[PDB]
Enzyme design. Structure first.
Site, PDB file in Angstrom:
ATOM      1  CG  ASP A  25      -2.024   0.941   1.151  1.00 43.56           C
ATOM      2  OD1 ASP A  25      -1.918   1.810   0.210  1.00 43.56           O
ATOM      3  OD2 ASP A  25      -2.972   0.639   1.799  1.00 43.56           O
ATOM      4  CB  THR A  26       1.980   3.538  -2.712  1.00 45.41           C
ATOM      5  OG1 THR A  26       0.771   3.598  -3.692  1.00 45.41           O
ATOM      6  CG2 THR A  26       2.702   2.524  -3.420  1.00 45.41           C
ATOM      7  N   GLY A  27      -0.396   4.131  -0.248  1.00 47.76           N
ATOM      8  CA  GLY A  27      -1.139   5.149   0.363  1.00 47.76           C
ATOM      9  C   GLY A  27      -1.126   4.994   1.876  1.00 47.76           C
TER      10      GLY A  27
HETATM   11  C1  LIG Z   1     -10.298   5.258  -1.372  1.00 46.78           C
HETATM   12  C2  LIG Z   1     -10.292   4.001  -0.121  1.00 46.78           C
HETATM   13  C3  LIG Z   1     -10.541   2.736  -1.037  1.00 46.78           C
HETATM   14  C4  LIG Z   1     -12.298   2.551  -1.509  1.00 46.78           C
HETATM   15  C5  LIG Z   1     -10.327   1.510  -0.001  1.00 46.78           C
HETATM   16  N1  LIG Z   1      -8.723   1.513   0.271  1.00 46.78           N
HETATM   17  C6  LIG Z   1      -8.460   1.991   1.465  1.00 46.78           C
HETATM   18  O1  LIG Z   1      -9.030   2.584   2.538  1.00 46.78           O
HETATM   19  C7  LIG Z   1      -6.903   1.953   1.920  1.00 46.78           C
HETATM   20  O2  LIG Z   1      -6.463   1.109   2.943  1.00 46.78           O
HETATM   21  C8  LIG Z   1      -6.313  -0.175   2.921  1.00 46.78           C
HETATM   22  C9  LIG Z   1      -7.477  -1.022   2.830  1.00 46.78           C
HETATM   23  C10 LIG Z   1      -7.552  -2.099   1.763  1.00 46.78           C
HETATM   24  C11 LIG Z   1      -8.930  -2.683   1.667  1.00 46.78           C
HETATM   25  C12 LIG Z   1      -9.974  -2.525   2.688  1.00 46.78           C
HETATM   26  C13 LIG Z   1      -9.660  -1.624   3.919  1.00 46.78           C
HETATM   27  C14 LIG Z   1      -8.535  -0.895   4.092  1.00 46.78           C
HETATM   28  C15 LIG Z   1      -6.428   3.456   1.753  1.00 46.78           C
HETATM   29  O3  LIG Z   1      -6.630   4.063   0.593  1.00 46.78           O
HETATM   30  C16 LIG Z   1      -5.054   3.527   2.254  1.00 46.78           C
HETATM   31  O4  LIG Z   1      -4.382   3.042   1.017  1.00 46.78           O
HETATM   32  C17 LIG Z   1      -4.684   5.072   2.840  1.00 46.78           C
HETATM   33  O5  LIG Z   1      -5.684   6.017   2.243  1.00 46.78           O
HETATM   34  C18 LIG Z   1      -5.161   7.261   1.923  1.00 46.78           C
HETATM   35  C19 LIG Z   1      -5.216   8.024   3.207  1.00 46.78           C
HETATM   36  C20 LIG Z   1      -3.750   9.095   3.382  1.00 46.78           C
HETATM   37  C21 LIG Z   1      -3.748   9.704   4.525  1.00 46.78           C
HETATM   38  C22 LIG Z   1      -5.015   9.951   5.380  1.00 46.78           C
HETATM   39  C23 LIG Z   1      -6.156   9.150   5.158  1.00 46.78           C
HETATM   40  C24 LIG Z   1      -6.205   8.422   3.801  1.00 46.78           C
HETATM   41  C25 LIG Z   1      -4.793   5.127   4.213  1.00 46.78           C
HETATM   42  O6  LIG Z   1      -5.877   5.012   4.950  1.00 46.78           O
HETATM   43  N2  LIG Z   1      -3.488   5.399   4.931  1.00 46.78           N
HETATM   44  C26 LIG Z   1      -3.559   5.726   6.398  1.00 46.78           C
HETATM   45  C27 LIG Z   1      -2.509   6.767   6.717  1.00 46.78           C
HETATM   46  O7  LIG Z   1      -1.548   6.608   6.086  1.00 46.78           O
HETATM   47  N3  LIG Z   1      -2.962   7.787   7.629  1.00 46.78           N
HETATM   48  C28 LIG Z   1      -2.210   8.819   7.672  1.00 46.78           C
HETATM   49  C29 LIG Z   1      -2.828   4.480   7.046  1.00 46.78           C
HETATM   50  C30 LIG Z   1      -2.512   4.436   8.498  1.00 46.78           C
HETATM   51  C31 LIG Z   1      -3.617   2.913   6.895  1.00 46.78           C
HETATM   52  C32 LIG Z   1      -2.903   1.789   7.087  1.00 46.78           C
HETATM   53  C33 LIG Z   1     -10.551   0.187  -0.529  1.00 46.78           C
HETATM   54  O8  LIG Z   1      -9.894  -0.346  -1.610  1.00 46.78           O
HETATM   55  N4  LIG Z   1     -11.613  -0.499   0.040  1.00 46.78           N
HETATM   56  C34 LIG Z   1     -11.712  -1.697  -0.428  1.00 46.78           C
END
Ligand SMILES: CC[C@H](C)[C@H](NC(=O)[C@H](OCc1ccccc1)[C@H](O)[C@@H](O)[C@@H](OCc1ccccc1)C(=O)N[C@H](C(=O)NC)[C@@H](C)CC)C(=O)NC
EC number: 3.4.23.16
Lengths: 99, 99
Positions: A25-27
């Site tokens: 996860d690059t995000g």
């Molecule tokens: C657009 C959301 C999308 C529909 C969803 N994916 C996710 O929620 C991803 O989480 C994995 C994930 C994958 C599948 C199910 C549940 C979770 C999420 O996009 C992370 O990539 C990342 O999001 C960007 C972000 C950055 C900074 C602050 C807030 C948010 C995030 O939440 N980063 C956090 C972060 O860096 N906070 C500063 C971190 C602590 C989480 C481990 C998904 O694919 N659901 C099926």
């Protein structure tokens, strides 16, 4: 290797003598795994994503093997619906985004 | 280009003639942007992340420029913490993970 994104980038990881599936996860700033037992002392932490924040336990200097590559770093454990390998560890295996 | 992950992979995107900053997120199935005005009708969608689910508006066939690469696809709009470029668009610009 080169991983395409047509499907979720899931890979096998080894941690604490256990094999698990995790998402590259690059995000994600941090690495968070489903509830499990790890050695050492931990510190409480709140991490937020889409949906809000969750309470996790922070373990430092944890060894993890990602696709055969060894990496060391902080690993958070908590009620995450999927195991996530974040940037703190992706950098250690030399992972980059290319296009 | 090649993007390392020591810092968040933030890039400039252009949508509706406006420049915004967004995160290249391999861990996101979808692309979600912060509240804004888009043309046409929208459909409802519920998406789940780390802290739960949020309600968003779905717009289809939206033109978005990512790092100079034009893509046309589905964009979600809702209470997201940051602009997120998910796999649906990352594949359109030919993005891959490498290590
Ligand atoms: C657009 C959301 C999308 C529909 C969803 N994916 C996710 O929620 C991803 O989480 C994995 C994930 C994958 C599948 C199910 C549940 C979770 C999420 O996009 C992370 O990539 C990342 O999001 C960007 C972000 C950055 C900074 C602050 C807030 C948010 C995030 O939440 N980063 C956090 C972060 O860096 N906070 C500063 C971190 C602590 C989480 C481990 C998904 O694919 N659901 C099926």
């Amino acid at each position: 290797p080169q991983i395409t994104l047509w499907q979720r980038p899931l890979v096998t990881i080894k941690i604490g003598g256990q094999l698990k599936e995790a998402l590259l996860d690059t995000g994600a700033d941090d690495t968070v795994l489903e509830e499990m037992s790890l050695p050492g002392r931990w510190k409480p932490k709140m991490i937020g994503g889409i949906g809000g924040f969750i309470k996790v336990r922070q373990y430092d200097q944890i060894l993890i093997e990602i696709c055969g590559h060894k990496a060391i770093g902080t690993v958070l454990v908590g009620p995450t619906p999927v195991n996530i390998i974040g940037r703190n560890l992706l950098t250690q295996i030399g992972c980059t985004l290319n296009f």
